[PDB]
Amino acid sequence: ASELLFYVNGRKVIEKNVDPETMLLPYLRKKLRLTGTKYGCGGGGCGACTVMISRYNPITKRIRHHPANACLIPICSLYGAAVTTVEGIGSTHTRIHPVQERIAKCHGTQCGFCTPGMVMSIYTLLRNHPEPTLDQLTDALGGNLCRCTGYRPIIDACKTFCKTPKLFAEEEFLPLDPTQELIFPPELMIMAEKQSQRTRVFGSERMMWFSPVTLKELLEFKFKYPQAPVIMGNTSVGPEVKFKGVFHPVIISPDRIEELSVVNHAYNGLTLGAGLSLAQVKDILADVVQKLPEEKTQMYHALLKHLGTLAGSQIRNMASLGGHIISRHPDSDLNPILAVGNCTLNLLSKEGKRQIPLNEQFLSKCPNADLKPQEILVSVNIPYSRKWEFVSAFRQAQRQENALAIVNSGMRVFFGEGDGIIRELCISYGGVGPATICAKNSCQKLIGRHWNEQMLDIACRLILNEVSLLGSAPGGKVEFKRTLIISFLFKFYLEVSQILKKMDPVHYPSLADKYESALEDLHSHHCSTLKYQNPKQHPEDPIGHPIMHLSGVKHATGEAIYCDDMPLVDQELFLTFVTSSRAHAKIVSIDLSEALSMPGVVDIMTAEHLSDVNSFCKFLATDKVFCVGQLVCAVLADSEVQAKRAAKRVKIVYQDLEPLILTIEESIQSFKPERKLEYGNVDEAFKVVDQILEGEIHMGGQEHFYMETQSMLVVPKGEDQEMDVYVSTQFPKYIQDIVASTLKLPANKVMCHVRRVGGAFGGKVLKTGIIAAVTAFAANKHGRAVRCVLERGEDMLITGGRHPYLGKYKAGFMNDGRILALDMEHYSNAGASLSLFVIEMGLLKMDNAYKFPNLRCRGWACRTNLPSNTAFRGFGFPQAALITESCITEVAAKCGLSPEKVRIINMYKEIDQTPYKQEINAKNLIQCWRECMAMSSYSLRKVAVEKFNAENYWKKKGLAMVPLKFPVGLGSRAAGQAAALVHIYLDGSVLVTHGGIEMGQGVHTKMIQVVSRELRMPMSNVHLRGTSTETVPNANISGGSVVADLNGLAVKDACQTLLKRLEPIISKNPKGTWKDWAQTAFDESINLSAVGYFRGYESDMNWEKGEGQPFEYFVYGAACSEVEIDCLTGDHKNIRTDIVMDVGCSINPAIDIGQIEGAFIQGMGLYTIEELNYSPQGILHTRGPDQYKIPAICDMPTELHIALLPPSQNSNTLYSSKGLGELGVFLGCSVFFAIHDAVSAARQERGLHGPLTLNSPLTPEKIRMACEDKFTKMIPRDEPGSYVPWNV
Amino acid sequence: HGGIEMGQGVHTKMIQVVSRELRMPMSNVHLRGTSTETVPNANISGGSVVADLNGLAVKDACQTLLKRLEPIISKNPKGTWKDWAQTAFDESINLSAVG
Amino acid sequence: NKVMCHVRRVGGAFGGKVLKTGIIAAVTAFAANKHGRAVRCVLERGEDML
Amino acid sequence: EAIYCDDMPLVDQELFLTFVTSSRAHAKIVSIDLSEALSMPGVVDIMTAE
């Protein structure tokens, strides 16, 4: 019966007979047509769907504003509330909000897909704290991810709100007026001011949803429907119905019940309401901690510690305390702490009040200690700590926040007045089994003992077998988890054996001098500076100026249309895929009968239904699958919901096939084509060298993790089989080809149109086209527009990633570290299909900065039963150059020289020759290295790090510096050709287009800068809509770091042609407007339309001889990075990074510096935190701590300096600029080798010499286990083939 | 081109022009419509001369295109338009032309 | 450069789909822009002749 | 199968525009009352020359 009534952006919204399953994000986008709020991930991790929620408290008379992730909010929860999206706070056709203005004008948007989420997080925080500190702002953005910007420019935007040659004018940003903000809708105040007791009911065919608004009613509903979940935040129930096949016919979702949100400050402690958010609990406890003395606030400190890291701001503000406790997630950060602290739960039934203790049995879901099915959690009591009572909580995740714990803990000790005899002890752990578990038996055996090292050795033994994991444990990482268990035990020993020292100095011993640093942990502040140059040029010429991205403000306001933001076209269908669940198996059968009969389903296509158009230059699996994630079926339905429902009812029966090949080593057991480069004579050189060294390095893959998933709309016109394809891709011409081929049509019938892409980084080409081809086949077959958009989980599985690499090397060198001989082997892991291109660029760019006089280099791509890998930002360089740096730091080790001494003496001279016999001027390579050594103060900081490491046993620092020679160029002249089309209308305005695609790199911004210079008119007079095969035909891929270079030359070419035609008119009226010139040109029959064309940079390679001139120019750079590691937990912190870069003359230094930072952080992630976990069966793991993590704000180095070396003329390139964009990625390994250095310093001090090869990614697991100590030796281990592991 | 099809068959005639000038069947040529986005500043479709005038402009683009390709055509006179177009791309010859 | 006009075919015009057409398009586009909505205007025969 | 202008599919949330036309050949416009028209089902806006 009831009606749902809430507000969105100030406007009333009413739904009668609303479906309770409707989530807010699709509702905003589809029913309200507010497409600013974006889908990124659908689990609440990325923050792209961030909105503000406002609520009136009728008793306290206060409006509360909190951020939240719209993907997880069911609209039935919003009754009487006010939502605000990015569109609500301002727009270009009203007034822009300052948050929107500044994030854009500080260049805090690249692709722009993450920008609305960032804006709403910052907006919401400024609504709660009008005059904030940067701490609060960066805390608010803990939940918000970005794959393009590197966060620095978003941090700068935030700083302009904080009362504490640049790229932006801060002194012109309009001030935040806190009184002219959005008014809370008065109707909602009036509704709130009259507490209706009537409980609301919403139904559909599938689900009943009850919102009780009194406590009486809540208990009434909990009795009737005992098995119905009580939804508070939906951050536990929501994510598991989405991708764990769970469904609830009845939901109970209470409104603000006062008894559920109590905050009692008792004499013995405090009792906290079960319906308080985790964010509100963090605030209550922060205040209590400051208002009370610091031995009654022991529990409250451990809770604050873990709440600082728990998820981000949006999830904390949605998630309830009762939800957290009842969920009983094994990785829960708060439950293990509550477990140890004598906490009790206040239960309430229709039958009565009742109280149970929060213990292990409860956390294990033993029904004796559990809630009975008909009752609800009202509140929890957390008592004050007694004097001589101490509490500690630890955790380790993949990154420092917004990441689920691999292992965590809560631990308590009680001494009871004076003497160090332990009278009580509770030790609880998470991530070590199905639930949070307490080591009670170990704890019994330790009662009576003193606090000293005799008891540690035994305590460690007797927990390590009580809280054991089998080698085949879910979650993997067994030996790391084993270590963390006892390493946290050590840290607790230290910590509490110091508060004892503090409180009772004479009776207890002080800690060992090299141990103290183990206690305080690594927790950031974010500083940055930027040098670059900027007389002779006109002030109206925009070339060289840091012009804001043209869509920057549209990103900030959500007015930028990305592919899925396009409005629903009349009667469009949705397409979703059934993907393979086996890595190498026979397809015995497919049953579609159940799926085909379900609501909305129109058609389900297997490979039979594509017949002779199931492959191009195969799309759908025929009779075998060759990796997980391979396409098998295509389900076409009236909606996305119906499509996915029906897809999950398709039954495919398999039969596994041998061999199941997963690694590169397995793949070496017919004929693979070799590539080879040879310089000098390496076989002779291996006889005149002082020493020889063999080794190898594995390198992991990498997900593109563009924030916009794969997305397209295919629309048949209904005439002559014309299709229009709107798709997020980097290569429209290829989309046109594969769709036309699939439909058996000429290319003139199929047109591909692309306005913008929300990031691509190489991973929106081949696989995109397959999906478009299949999608277009369905569209054409049924005469319907068809939309296909992938969810994040499917996307990562179906699309590939970067190629994993194996490097083997034999290096002959001199005792001064110079490398005269080098034999080298590269192996890419290709996945199911071919990849050879990536090997070729690997080998050509392998040299990097160094002159190897004798070199044999050989590479092979290796097919496995994994998703087929694709090209990525860098194109083999980040892999290939890491092989050679690993080889250097090993040679450095064997010479007792720093790697940076070995690098500097193996570098190319000013003039020198590459392994492929191309001449190079490497002057700017030397300068880049000189200036980076000077700027960074490398030599002084080197002794500072050595000094530190001599004084600290459990925490080490490291420093590294790597150089960059990044060559640029494609295989042929034809691959570099580029075209444009320019119109001048009779009002003088200009429309330009070209074959390049805007993916967030600012190519369209740069082309208007070119047009503005060449025609001598303001950029406001030029306009560009998009890219289209209809306007500019035969365009090459938007790739190879040269999109702007090449399309810039073609745009310039059209402009000059146009200016030549007009020069008669211009000379005869030199003071006239473009409107006058255009008009008289028309009046004199002069054409105002012109194609522009650039033929391409000359380029070639004879791969037989290994010699050629493949590259047009070389980008030079260097980068220094400093880190501190925790040897007990494997954590690390990026302290500082320094980057110098030769860019020629930057066409736009804002955009070019944006690309350096973005690439650097992307490389930083590749080499440290980004990790793809596959099972022995080839299944990708995507849940719990197996979650893939891209770099967040907390990973961005505390200090960051970036210099652009002053220019020196490249007549061959566009305005002497050098195409950066992909370069910066390899510079991320400065962090890798800084960590490598830190680990070596721990291994030298402790005396473990010889072979240390650390592989990429350098994860916390790999760091910890490399810092061997008594705890690494102590842990129990397995035989290799005795168990089947969760991973590898 | 800038002409509008009102039922007088102007688009039919332009494909007839293209077919003669590039020496290819009309089945190989296609036209979607008219747009200020593709052809700017076009005059009214009126005065009994829409086909005459836009026909001369279509012919002009075709001839330009044929001049660029004549090297490729003389070197392979029995080749398809697919072959000529492909080798033109491979030799960095532009296949778009204003008339 | 912000406004583009696209025409596939006309079902006869004979001169009578120029000035008056443009006025109606101008008024129509003003409404569309004002309300952020696509707006369709099609005349019935009686109104059209008048 | 030939698409003429009104044959184009309905685009998401499009509105329709229709005109009130003059009923006199040469007259002064003393007044326009839109109050009844504006209150009726579906109506979004009514524009005069103002």
Ligand SMILES: Cc1cc2nc3c(=O)[nH]c(=O)nc-3n(C[C@H](O)[C@H](O)[C@H](O)COP(=O)(O)OP(=O)(O)OC[C@H]3O[C@@H](n4cnc5c(N)ncnc54)[C@H](O)[C@@H]3O)c2cc1C
């Ligand atoms: C992106 C993301 C990141 C996260 N990161 C972390 C992290 O770093 N560390 C960590 O520990 N956790 C993390 N979590 C887990 C999160 O903290 C929990 O999901 C949350 O606390 C559950 O609260 P809720 O209100 O959303 O529970 P809901 O999803 O609303 O409910 C879950 C269960 O609780 C029941 N329930 C709720 N309230 C009551 C009550 N009063 N009485 C009886 N039953 C009740 C429901 O019936 C249901 O069965 C993360 C979650 C997400 C989505």
Ligand SMILES: Nc1nc2c(c(=O)[nH]1)N[C@H]1C(S)=C(S)[C@@H](COP(=O)(O)O)O[C@H]1N2
């Ligand atoms: N924001 C953003 N920057 C990006 C990309 C992207 O998808 N988004 N792609 C990268 C890749 S793979 C390439 S190959 C280059 C190509 O564009 P450019 O030649 O203009 O640098 O952009 C790089 N920078």
Ligand SMILES: Nc1nc2c(c(=O)[nH]1)N[C@H]1C(S)=C(S)[C@@H](COP(=O)(O)O)O[C@H]1N2
């Ligand atoms: N079917 C048809 N024929 C038509 C018209 C039309 O609208 N429909 N318009 C006429 C008018 S007014 C003119 S001015 C000419 C212009 O086109 P042409 O120059 O190609 O003859 O077409 C004439 N023939």
Ligand code: MOS
């Ligand atoms: O150069 Mo990477 O976009 S193919």
Ligand code: MOS
């Ligand atoms: O020539 Mo009549 O179409 S103006």
Ligand code: FES
């Ligand atoms: S934040 Fe909801 S989409 Fe990831």
Ligand code: FES
């Ligand atoms: S701009 Fe943040 S994701 Fe590309």
